[PDB]
Design a protein around this motif. Structure first.
Motif, short mmCIF file in Angstrom:
data_model
loop_
_atom_site.label_atom_id
_atom_site.label_comp_id
_atom_site.label_asym_id
_atom_site.label_seq_id
_atom_site.Cartn_x
_atom_site.Cartn_y
_atom_site.Cartn_z
N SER A 64 -12.47 -8.12 -3.55
CA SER A 64 -13.38 -8.35 -2.41
C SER A 64 -15.21 -7.61 -2.69
O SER A 64 -14.72 -6.72 -3.57
CB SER A 64 -12.59 -7.83 -1.19
OG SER A 64 -12.33 -6.37 -1.80
N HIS A 78 -17.40 -5.41 -0.93
CA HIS A 78 -18.08 -4.85 0.00
C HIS A 78 -20.07 -4.05 -0.22
O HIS A 78 -19.83 -3.53 -0.92
CB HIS A 78 -17.66 -3.76 0.84
CG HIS A 78 -15.84 -3.99 0.78
ND1 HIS A 78 -14.92 -4.67 2.86
CD2 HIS A 78 -14.82 -4.00 0.13
CE1 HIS A 78 -14.27 -5.56 2.13
NE2 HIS A 78 -13.49 -5.21 -0.06
N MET A 100 -18.60 -0.99 4.47
CA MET A 100 -17.31 -1.93 4.32
C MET A 100 -17.41 -3.11 4.46
O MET A 100 -16.37 -3.56 5.70
CB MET A 100 -16.63 -0.46 4.80
CG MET A 100 -15.74 0.48 4.66
SD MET A 100 -14.58 1.38 6.35
CE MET A 100 -14.59 3.37 5.57
N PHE A 113 -17.16 -6.70 4.62
CA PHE A 113 -17.04 -7.31 2.84
C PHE A 113 -18.45 -8.41 3.58
O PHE A 113 -19.19 -9.09 4.58
CB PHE A 113 -16.28 -9.06 3.57
CG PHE A 113 -14.69 -8.22 4.18
CD1 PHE A 113 -13.84 -7.91 5.53
CD2 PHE A 113 -13.48 -8.15 2.50
CE1 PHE A 113 -12.54 -6.84 4.78
CE2 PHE A 113 -12.33 -8.27 2.92
CZ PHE A 113 -12.12 -7.96 4.50
N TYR A 165 -7.38 -1.93 9.15
CA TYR A 165 -6.41 -0.85 8.88
C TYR A 165 -5.33 -0.84 10.43
O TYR A 165 -6.27 -0.46 11.87
CB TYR A 165 -7.57 0.28 8.58
CG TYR A 165 -8.49 0.53 7.44
CD1 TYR A 165 -7.79 -0.54 6.37
CD2 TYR A 165 -8.77 1.63 7.31
CE1 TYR A 165 -8.70 -0.57 5.06
CE2 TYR A 165 -10.25 0.52 6.49
CZ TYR A 165 -10.29 0.61 4.67
OH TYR A 165 -10.48 0.15 3.86
N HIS A 209 -12.81 6.46 1.02
CA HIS A 209 -13.94 6.13 0.71
C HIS A 209 -15.00 6.81 0.44
O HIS A 209 -15.67 7.16 -0.33
CB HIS A 209 -14.56 5.28 2.35
CG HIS A 209 -15.61 4.88 2.41
ND1 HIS A 209 -16.14 3.68 1.64
CD2 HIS A 209 -17.17 4.37 3.48
CE1 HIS A 209 -17.41 3.30 2.09
NE2 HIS A 209 -17.24 3.52 2.78
N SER A 259 -6.97 3.50 -3.95
CA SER A 259 -6.10 3.82 -2.37
C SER A 259 -5.23 4.55 -2.14
O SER A 259 -4.26 4.20 -3.08
CB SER A 259 -6.51 3.17 -1.54
OG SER A 259 -5.29 1.99 -1.28
N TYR A 316 -1.34 1.33 2.48
CA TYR A 316 -1.94 1.73 3.58
C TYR A 316 -1.71 -0.08 4.02
O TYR A 316 -1.21 -0.96 3.31
CB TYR A 316 -3.41 1.16 3.58
CG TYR A 316 -4.71 0.51 2.80
CD1 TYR A 316 -4.62 0.27 1.32
CD2 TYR A 316 -4.59 -0.53 3.70
CE1 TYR A 316 -5.20 0.07 1.28
CE2 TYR A 316 -5.69 -1.60 2.74
CZ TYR A 316 -6.16 -1.40 1.73
OH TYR A 316 -6.87 -2.36 1.24
N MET A 326 -3.10 -3.08 6.04
CA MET A 326 -3.93 -4.13 6.55
C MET A 326 -3.65 -5.53 7.41
O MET A 326 -2.56 -5.78 7.23
CB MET A 326 -4.11 -5.01 5.02
CG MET A 326 -5.66 -6.21 6.09
SD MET A 326 -6.70 -6.83 4.69
CE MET A 326 -8.00 -7.62 5.71
N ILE A 355 -19.69 -2.34 -3.60
CA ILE A 355 -17.96 -1.94 -3.67
C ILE A 355 -17.62 -3.06 -4.35
O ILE A 355 -17.17 -3.87 -3.42
CB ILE A 355 -17.76 -1.28 -2.37
CG1 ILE A 355 -18.51 0.11 -2.23
CG2 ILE A 355 -16.28 -0.18 -2.83
CD1 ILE A 355 -18.18 1.00 -0.82
N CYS A 370 -13.38 -4.27 -4.91
CA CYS A 370 -12.06 -4.02 -4.23
C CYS A 370 -11.30 -4.67 -5.33
O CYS A 370 -11.44 -5.93 -5.09
CB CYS A 370 -12.04 -4.15 -3.31
SG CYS A 370 -12.75 -2.64 -2.41
N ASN A 426 -7.51 -6.53 -4.83
CA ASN A 426 -6.73 -5.26 -3.68
C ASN A 426 -5.34 -6.22 -3.82
O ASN A 426 -5.16 -7.15 -4.65
CB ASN A 426 -6.46 -6.17 -2.25
CG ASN A 426 -8.95 -5.55 -2.53
OD1 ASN A 426 -8.67 -4.51 -1.48
ND2 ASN A 426 -9.35 -6.52 -1.85
C1 LIG Z 1 -12.21 1.56 -2.31
S1 LIG Z 1 -10.89 1.57 -1.21
O1 LIG Z 1 -10.76 3.25 -0.13
O2 LIG Z 1 -9.39 1.30 -1.56
C2 LIG Z 1 -10.74 0.06 -0.17
S2 LIG Z 1 -9.90 -0.64 0.16
C3 LIG Z 1 -10.90 -1.65 1.12
C4 LIG Z 1 -10.17 -3.24 2.01
C5 LIG Z 1 -10.56 -4.62 1.05
C6 LIG Z 1 -10.18 -5.57 1.80
F1 LIG Z 1 -9.97 -6.68 1.23
C7 LIG Z 1 -9.07 -5.07 2.49
C8 LIG Z 1 -8.72 -4.26 2.92
F2 LIG Z 1 -8.60 -4.35 4.53
C9 LIG Z 1 -9.50 -2.94 2.80
C10 LIG Z 1 -12.02 -1.56 1.34
C11 LIG Z 1 -12.28 0.81 0.62
C12 LIG Z 1 -13.52 0.94 0.60
O3 LIG Z 1 -14.11 1.46 1.86
C13 LIG Z 1 -14.43 -0.34 1.43
F3 LIG Z 1 -16.39 -0.77 1.59
F4 LIG Z 1 -14.71 -1.77 -0.39
C14 LIG Z 1 -13.40 -1.92 1.67
#
Ligand SMILES: CS(=O)(=O)c1sc(-c2cc(F)cc(F)c2)c2c1[C@H](O)C(F)(F)C2
Lengths: 107, 112
Positions: B12, B14, B18, B20, B47, B59, B70, B73, B75, B100, B102, B104
């Motif tokens: 993904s 971002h 945050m 998408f 989340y 973040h 991370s 967590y 989703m 950003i 990601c 995942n």
């Molecule tokens: C780097 S991190 O903090 O581990 C993490 S996880 C995540 C994410 C990505 C998904 F596709 C699904 C989901 F639920 C959350 C994101 C992030 C970052 O804060 C983001 F802004 F880039 C968004």
């Protein structure tokens, strides 16, 4: 303005996001299975190969590289490829390279 | 049969808030979402409330260090329920943050 690609350590495109059409003119199916160095200007090929070799040694740190990519519209586009290796820590599978490729200015 | 690690991995992209800006099609067979319905939506909307604070801190660390792993967590999946994930986030900067990236990985058992 940019697209994501995934490569094996040799440079072969194994994943290409559809934003590649707007960026370099090619469809993802025209890039898959081909090596990134096959679209690279002869003066930049060795730099691109050295960068792919080195990104593997940098532990997930980003390695950027600027090079000229031959678009489908027959132009050398300046691209800035930011790459980093990913290896799923729950496995010992060979790492692959993730890239974000953006058409940038050489100015 | 259950899916392996590679098949449970989706990419993904971002913006710095945050939201998408891109999501790999693999998310559909894992979490139910179609990438197009995720665009413009904050990752925070998905989340589980009990992970929100930990994700805020992850973040913040990502924004200062440029890369983060991370913790585990949850989703929210499209048709209810929560799936456990782990993400490796990386900031793509102009050598100023541009986005950003990601990677995942779904920790939960996913059939097929
Ligand atoms: C780097 S991190 O903090 O581990 C993490 S996880 C995540 C994410 C990505 C998904 F596709 C699904 C989901 F639920 C959350 C994101 C992030 C970052 O804060 C983001 F802004 F880039 C968004």
């Amino acid at each position: 303005t940019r697209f994501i690609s995934r490569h094996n350590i040799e440079g072969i495109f194994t994943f290409v996001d559809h934003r590649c059409v707007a960026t370099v003119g090619y469809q993802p199916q025209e890039l898959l299975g081909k090596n990134i160095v096959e679209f690279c200007h002869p003066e930049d090929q060795q730099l691109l190969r050295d960068s792919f070799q080195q990104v593997v040694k940098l532990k997930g740190q980003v390695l950027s590289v600027m090079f000229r990519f031959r678009s489908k519209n027959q132009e050398w586009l300046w691209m800035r490829t930011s790459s980093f290796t990913f290896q799923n820590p729950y496995s010992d599978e060979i790492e692959y390279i993730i890239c974000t490729n953006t058409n940038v200015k050489n100015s | 049969e259950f899916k392996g690690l590679d098949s449970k991995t989706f990419l993904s992209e971002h913006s710095m808030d945050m939201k998408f800006t891109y999501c790999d099609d693999r998310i559909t067979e894992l979490i139910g979402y179609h990438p197009e319905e995720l665009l413009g939506r904050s990752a925070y909307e998905f989340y589980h409330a009990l992970d929100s604070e930990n994700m805020t801190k992850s973040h913040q660390n990502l924004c200062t260090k440029g890369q983060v792993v991370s913790g585990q967590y949850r989703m929210l999946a499209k048709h209810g329920g929560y799936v456990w994930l782990e993400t490796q986030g990386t900031v793509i900067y102009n050598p100023q943050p541009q986005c950003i990236m990601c990677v995942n990985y779904v920790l939960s058992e996913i059939e097929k």
